[PDB]
Amino acid sequence: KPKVSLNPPWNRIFKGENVTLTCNGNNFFEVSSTKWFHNGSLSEETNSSLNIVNAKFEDSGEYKCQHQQVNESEPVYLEVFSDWLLLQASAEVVMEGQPLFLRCHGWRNWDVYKVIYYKDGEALKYWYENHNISITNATVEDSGTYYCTGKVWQLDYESEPLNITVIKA
Amino acid sequence: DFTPPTVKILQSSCDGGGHFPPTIQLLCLVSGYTPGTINITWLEDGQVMDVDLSTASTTQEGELASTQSELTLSQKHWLSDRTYTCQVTYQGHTFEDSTKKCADSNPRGVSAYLSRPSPFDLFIRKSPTITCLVVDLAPSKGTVNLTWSRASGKPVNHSTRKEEKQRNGTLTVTSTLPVGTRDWIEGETYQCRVTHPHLPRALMRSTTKTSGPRAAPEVYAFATPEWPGSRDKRTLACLIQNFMPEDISVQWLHNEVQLPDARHSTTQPRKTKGSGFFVFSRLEVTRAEWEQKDEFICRAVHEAASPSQTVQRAVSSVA
Amino acid sequence: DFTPPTVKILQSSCDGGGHFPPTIQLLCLVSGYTPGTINITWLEDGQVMDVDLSTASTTQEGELASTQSELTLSQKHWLSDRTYTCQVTYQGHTFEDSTKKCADSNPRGVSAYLSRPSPFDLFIRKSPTITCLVVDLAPSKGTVNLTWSRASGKPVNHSTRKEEKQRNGTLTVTSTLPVGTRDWIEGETYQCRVTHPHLPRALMRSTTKTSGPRAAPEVYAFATPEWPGSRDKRTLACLIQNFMPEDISVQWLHNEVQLPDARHSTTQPRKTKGSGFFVFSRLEVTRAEWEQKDEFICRAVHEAASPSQTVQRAVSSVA
Numbered sequence: 001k002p003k004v005s006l007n008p009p010w011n012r013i014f015k016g017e018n019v020t021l022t023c024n025g026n027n028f029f030e031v032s033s034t035k036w037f038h039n040g041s042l043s044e045e046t047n048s049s050l051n052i053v054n055a056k057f058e059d060s061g062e063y064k065c066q067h068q069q070v071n072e073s074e075p076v077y078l079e080v081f082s083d084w085l086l087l088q089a090s091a092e093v094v095m096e097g098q099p100l101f102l103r104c105h106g107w108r109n110w111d112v113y114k115v116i117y118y119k120d121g122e123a124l125k126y127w128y129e130n131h132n133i134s135i136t137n138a139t140v141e142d143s144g145t146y147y148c149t150g151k152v153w154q155l156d157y158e159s160e161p162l163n164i165t166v167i168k169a
Numbered sequence: 170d171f172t173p174p175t176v177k178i179l180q181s182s183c184d185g186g187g188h189f190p191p192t193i194q195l196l197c198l199v200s201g202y203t204p205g206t207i208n209i210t211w212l213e214d215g216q217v218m219d220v221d222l223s224t225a226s227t228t229q230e231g232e233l234a235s236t237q238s239e240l241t242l243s244q245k246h247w248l249s250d251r252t253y254t255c256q257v258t259y260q261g262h263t264f265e266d267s268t269k270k271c272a273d274s275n276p277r278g279v280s281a282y283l284s285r286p287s288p289f290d291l292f293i294r295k296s297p298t299i300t301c302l303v304v305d306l307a308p309s310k311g312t313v314n315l316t317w318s319r320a321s322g323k324p325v326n327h328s329t330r331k332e333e334k335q336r337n338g339t340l341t342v343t344s345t346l347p348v349g350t351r352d353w354i355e356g357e358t359y360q361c362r363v364t365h366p367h368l369p370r371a372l373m374r375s376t377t378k379t380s381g382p383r384a385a386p387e388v389y390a391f392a393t394p395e396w397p398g399s400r401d402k403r404t405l406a407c408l409i410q411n412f413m414p415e416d417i418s419v420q421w422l423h424n425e426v427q428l429p430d431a432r433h434s435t436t437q438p439r440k441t442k443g444s445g446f447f448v449f450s451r452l453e454v455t456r457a458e459w460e461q462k463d464e465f466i467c468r469a470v471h472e473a474a475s476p477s478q479t480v481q482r483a484v485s486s487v488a
Numbered sequence: 489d490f491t492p493p494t495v496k497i498l499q500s501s502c503d504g505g506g507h508f509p510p511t512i513q514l515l516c517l518v519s520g521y522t523p524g525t526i527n528i529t530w531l532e533d534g535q536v537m538d539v540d541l542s543t544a545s546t547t548q549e550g551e552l553a554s555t556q557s558e559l560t561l562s563q564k565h566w567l568s569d570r571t572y573t574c575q576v577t578y579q580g581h582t583f584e585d586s587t588k589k590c591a592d593s594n595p596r597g598v599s600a601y602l603s604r605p606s607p608f609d610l611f612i613r614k615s616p617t618i619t620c621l622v623v624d625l626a627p628s629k630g631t632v633n634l635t636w637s638r639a640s641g642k643p644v645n646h647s648t649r650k651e652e653k654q655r656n657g658t659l660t661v662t663s664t665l666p667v668g669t670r671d672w673i674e675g676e677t678y679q680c681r682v683t684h685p686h687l688p689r690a691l692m693r694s695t696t697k698t699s700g701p702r703a704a705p706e707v708y709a710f711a712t713p714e715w716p717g718s719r720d721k722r723t724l725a726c727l728i729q730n731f732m733p734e735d736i737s738v739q740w741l742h743n744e745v746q747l748p749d750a751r752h753s754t755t756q757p758r759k760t761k762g763s764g765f766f767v768f769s770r771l772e773v774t775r776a777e778w779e780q781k782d783e784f785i786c787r788a789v790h791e792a793a794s795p796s797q798t799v800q801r802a803v804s805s806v807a
């Protein structure tokens with residue numbers, strides 16, 4: 001089957017941001033045309049890449065793609081928020097040893113200072129300016145509800161929490 | 170017709186390592202003007218400082234006068250980012266210029282505050298209002314959306330709106346909404362909602378009558394004794410304590426006039442060790458006032474006071 | 489004999505929002521010297537600037553002369569962090585002063601605070617200390633270099649260096665240095681200097697005694713009358729006012745021994761309407777205490793109090 005790829009990879013964006021869903025698999029059948037499925041309704045896009053430009057609230061929800069095969073491509077989910085700080089994450093479920101990037105992101109490229117990440121309540125790491133967390137070997141204990149406190153325009157903002165869980169491969 | 174004076178402020182330079190000197194001099198220069206009476210007042214975030222802390226000098230060259238005023242500040246105050254204003258009064262006309270600690274970059278974001286009605290306004294004036302004050306917005310393009318609502322869905326009254334540019338370069342917006350007296354007393358909740366296209370999300374504040382228990386204030390008023398020097402100043406004080414909830418209005422009354430609020434100072438409510446809050450109020454009085462009438466009444470307006478939401482106590486300085 | 493002229497550099501103001509103006513004026517002042525030949529040259533990073541870029545003028549008052557020179561710089565040059573030197577040549581001898589773009593005390597978001605001695609520690613215990621606290625550092629490896637110094641170069645003692653990681657993922661470092669009582673009272677300035685490997689430059693804080701006028705505190709003490717239903721409790725109120733500078737300690741004593749600080753609530757110093765500051769102190773007492781001894785002493789420690797920087801007033805609840 002084909003799988004669904006995200007550029008940028010992050011399945012959690014802010015309002016107004018772009019994202020491009022590309023989706024591909026083994027070339028047993030030649031690449032001719034694709035079908036798209038936002039929420040369940042068939043979308044009017046044929047091209048193999050769908051350009052979701054200027055996100056609205058209704059742009060949330062289950063996404064899916066399909067080719068001329070007989071079986072469909074899993075339901076990637078895209079949440080869209082409007083807020084001050086979104087703790088973005090690469091993937092919501094991972095298998096050990098794969099890369100995991102976390103990034104405490106601010107509205108429209110704005111720079112968040114005094115950033116501290118929390119994993120399950122405790123202070124995982126603090127840095128003066130914004131940073132990635134990058135763990136290449138996510139342990140089974142890495143599973144947690146994460147969230148980040150930041151400082152944008154001198155004022156304090158907490159991101160909505162997001163629970164993530166690793167599994168044994 | 171006279172030539173316009175102009176005003177500019179120079180300051181001490183920090184040194185070759187970037188370090189502040191231990192004191193900072195601010196020099197307000199009032200260039201060539203038509204000779205006349207002139208006053209210079211320095212303000213720190215708008216409040217007048219005692220004239221003893223600064224000097225002033227006036228020279229005349231030919232037919233033109235020149236004036237300079239010098240203010241001395243500690244390094245700590247300068248580093249605390251307070252704003253200083255040079256206020257020039259000349260022939261009944263006011264000029265001004267402002268300064269604060271310099272900076273390479275000055276980020277700021279919008280913040281919002283929402284008050285409750287004062288007990289004085291609720292129970293004496295019988296015209297309660299609430300105020301939503303939004304400060305430190307960046308003066309971008311466009312008006313800032315400010316909407317009032319009630320949790321019950323019942324209609325709101327028309328509000329009034331003021332927008333005022335500040336010395337530090339921001340734009341403070343104040344919105345005042347009249348509230349129903351019975352509505353407020355019966356526990357209605359009012360919400361202020363702030364929107365703007367450049368904001369990430371809406372800012373929301375809400376206010377409602379405090380749900381804590383009630384307790385009436387105790388009041389005690391005192392006068393300080395006579396001693397040398399302070400012959401014509403006999404500072405009075407009032408202690409208001411053991412009240413619940415914390416919101417209280419304190420005024421001073423003298424000879425059937427309620428004196429302006431600016432005459433006296435009042436501390437912020439703080440918790441007593443046991444049960445309730447307390448405040449102190451301090452009022453400096455003059456010889457002519459107590460010779461007019463020496464009875465001074467400290468009055469508290471508070472939701473738990475009985476029988477009419479007021480409590481008052483008189484003091485006489487002579488006895 | 490050699491006559492040392494003094495040199496000082498003043499500069500233009502940025503405005504009330506901290507933004508730079510289109511050009512920067514620097515004003516080099518040579519104030520109060522025996523008249524003679526004088527030349528003023530400006531250097532930008534050690535090279536002589538063109539003569540037409542600055543203008544000098546001279547006045548005379550009595551015997552003493554005064555000279556000034558004004559240099560105009562573009563905003564860009566000021567912001568490039570070049571060093572500007574005012575070079576005064578008087579009777580063939582050279583006198584210099586220098587400046588460069590300042591540095592705003594918060595390079596990587598860290599904060600540092602430096603306290604003054606408490607008056608109680610200084611005048612009663614005669615063991616004054618100062619404390620330097622630096623917060624919001626990263627918990628990385630490599631110990632912070634903390635150094636103390638006096639502007640005069642005289643020796644300092646060892647301090648209690650202590651670090652601890654916080655529950656919020658930050659690291660705070662605190663150090664307390666004992667200082668000489670006389671050293672402080674005669675106006676020494678103490679400097680706390682912190683260097684971390686990740687910080688781009690060293691961060692410094694400085695503290696020194698006040699430069700304002702001196703005023704001893706007035707102390708007044710009152711006992712509340714008995715309130716119905718509270719036979720076994722009373723509140724004592726102490727008013728401390730018209731002191732300068734603002735630093736003050738308040739203690740309560742009973743039976744010649746100082747009561748714990750948790751027993752009483754004291755406000756922060758706030759300005760009166762004229763000269764000086766005031767505070768109120770509040771102490772609730774019990775029947776067992778005043779039956780043990782019904783005399784309670786409100787004592788203020790303040791740098792302006794004579795003869796031993798301490799003034800007190802006793803009060804009796806029964807009378």
Ligand SMILES: *[C@@H]1O[C@H](CO)[C@@H](O[C@@H]2O[C@H](CO)[C@@H](O[C@@H]3O[C@H](CO[C@H]4O[C@H](CO)[C@@H](O)[C@H](O)[C@@H]4O)[C@@H](O)[C@H](O[C@H]4O[C@H](CO)[C@@H](O)[C@H](O)[C@@H]4O)[C@@H]3O)[C@H](O)[C@H]2NC(C)=O)[C@H](O)[C@H]1NC(C)=O
Nearest residue numbers: 277280282283284285300302304305335336337338339341
């Ligand atoms: C640039 O200049 C402007 C104006 O000079 C500054 O704006 C100030 O902003 C601060 C906060 O950012 C304001 O402080 C707030 O004032 C509110 C107004 O309340 C007044 O009225 C009530 C009665 O309704 C009185 O009881 C009260 O004492 C005031 O007189 C307060 O309600 C706010 O209190 C809130 O914060 C405190 C903590 O500080 C809480 O304990 C409270 O519960 C409450 O949540 C607050 O004090 C200030 O009023 C603004 N100035 C003016 C003139 O309005 C900018 O700050 C300045 N910019 C910079 C960078 O300095």
Ligand SMILES: *[C@@H]1O[C@H](CO)[C@@H](O[C@@H]2O[C@H](CO)[C@@H](O[C@@H]3O[C@H](CO[C@H]4O[C@H](CO)[C@@H](O)[C@H](O)[C@@H]4O)[C@@H](O)[C@H](O[C@H]4O[C@H](CO)[C@@H](O)[C@H](O)[C@@H]4O)[C@@H]3O)[C@H](O)[C@H]2NC(C)=O)[C@H](O)[C@H]1NC(C)=O
Nearest residue numbers: 114115116249599601603621623624654655656657658660
């Ligand atoms: C991560 O967590 C740490 C701690 O867990 C936070 O660090 C705190 O930072 C705040 C702000 O920097 C500290 O608050 C400061 O406390 C000082 C204590 O002074 C003592 O002495 C005076 C005089 O005797 C007393 O009045 C006071 O109550 C204390 O007993 C204050 O002096 C500081 O004053 C500063 O703020 C005031 C306004 O409130 C200004 O007027 C002053 O000029 C000065 O700027 C300040 O209030 C706090 O103490 C720190 N915690 C600890 C345990 O020390 C980090 O901030 C946090 N990081 C993030 C990103 O949230």
Ligand SMILES: *[C@@H]1O[C@H](CO)[C@@H](O[C@@H]2O[C@H](CO)[C@@H](O[C@H]3O[C@H](CO)[C@@H](O)[C@H](O)[C@@H]3O)[C@H](O)[C@H]2NC(C)=O)[C@H](O)[C@H]1NC(C)=O
Nearest residue numbers: 038039040041056057058059060061062078079080081082
């Ligand atoms: C596809 O399914 C999605 C999830 O079932 C659904 O997402 C939801 O969309 C609504 C509005 O489009 C969002 O509501 C937002 O707007 C209201 C009004 O301002 C706010 O009060 C809400 O808090 C929110 O911001 C929902 O939040 C959103 N749900 C999720 C989980 O994101 C899509 O609308 C569906 N799309 C179609 C075309 O059916």
Ligand SMILES: *[C@@H]1O[C@H](CO)[C@@H](O)[C@H](O)[C@H]1NC(C)=O
Nearest residue numbers: 016017018019051052053054
């Ligand atoms: C979204 O995509 C379009 C098409 O490339 C682009 O022009 C637009 O700028 C994007 N949105 C933003 C906010 O950059």
Ligand SMILES: *[C@@H]1O[C@H](CO)[C@@H](O)[C@H](O)[C@H]1NC(C)=O
Nearest residue numbers: 101102103104130131132133
């Ligand atoms: C986080 O990583 C992504 C790519 O992995 C990068 O584009 C982004 O800038 C990083 N975040 C920060 C704050 O640098």
Ligand SMILES: *[C@@H]1O[C@H](CO)[C@@H](O)[C@H](O)[C@H]1NC(C)=O
Nearest residue numbers: 144145146161162163164165
């Ligand atoms: C993620 O973790 C939190 C923390 O216990 C949990 O309450 C939440 O339900 C989890 N999310 C899902 C989808 O199971």
